[PDB]
Design a protein around this ligand. Structure first.
Ligand SMILES: Cc1[nH]c2cc(C#N)ccc2c1CCN1C[C@@H](C(N)=O)CCC1=O
Ligand SMILES: [Zn+2]
Length: 139
């Protein structure tokens, strides 16, 4: 689990969105596993606007942060789950690192701010849903 709080928005994995998230829906994209809902309190997370390929992510299944190198956002094949059939997920970045399904939502950050959240994994790889292109999260 985990979310990004920026301005009047909450960014979560679309497959983990709650009833309140869907009743205050701003935008969702199944192909990216993202959902954004509106909040009443103001968030102070900063979103990165960069092309970094190094950062640190939080891994709840180890209660630890790990530094990683990660690929550029792209269309990558993701195996089936209870939430989606097997498909291409877009705007996804892979890194070599530990992750389990419950790790979804852990933040990946670089020196510029929040880059994305854990969304996929398996085989010693961890995949992050990018949020750096969502310029409207700031405006
Ligand atoms: C973060 C992670 N690490 C894993 C390791 C293993 C192992 N072994 C298995 C799964 C994972 C997952 C999450 C897989 N997943 C993908 C999500 C999506 N974005 O399509 C939908 C829900 C879901 O469970
Ligand atoms: Zn950066």
């Amino acid at each position: 689990s985990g979310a990004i709080y920026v301005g009047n928005y909450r960014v979560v994995n679309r497959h983990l969105a709650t009833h309140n998230d869907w009743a205050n829906l701003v935008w969702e994209d199944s192909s990216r596993d993202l959902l954004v809902s509106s909040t009443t309190a103001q968030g102070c997370d900063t979103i990165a606007r960069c092309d970094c390929q190094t950062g640190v992510y939080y891994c709840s299944s180890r209660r630890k942060h790990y530094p990683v190198s990660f690929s550029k956002p792209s269309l990558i094949f993701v195996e089936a789950s209870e939430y989606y059939p097997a498909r291409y997920q877009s705007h996804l970045m892979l890194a070599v690192g530990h992750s389990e399904p419950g790790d979804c939502g852990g933040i990946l950050r670089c020196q510029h701010g929040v880059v994305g959240i854990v969304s996929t994994g398996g085989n010693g790889l961890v995949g992050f849903a990018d949020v750096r292109d969502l310029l409207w999260l700031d405006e």
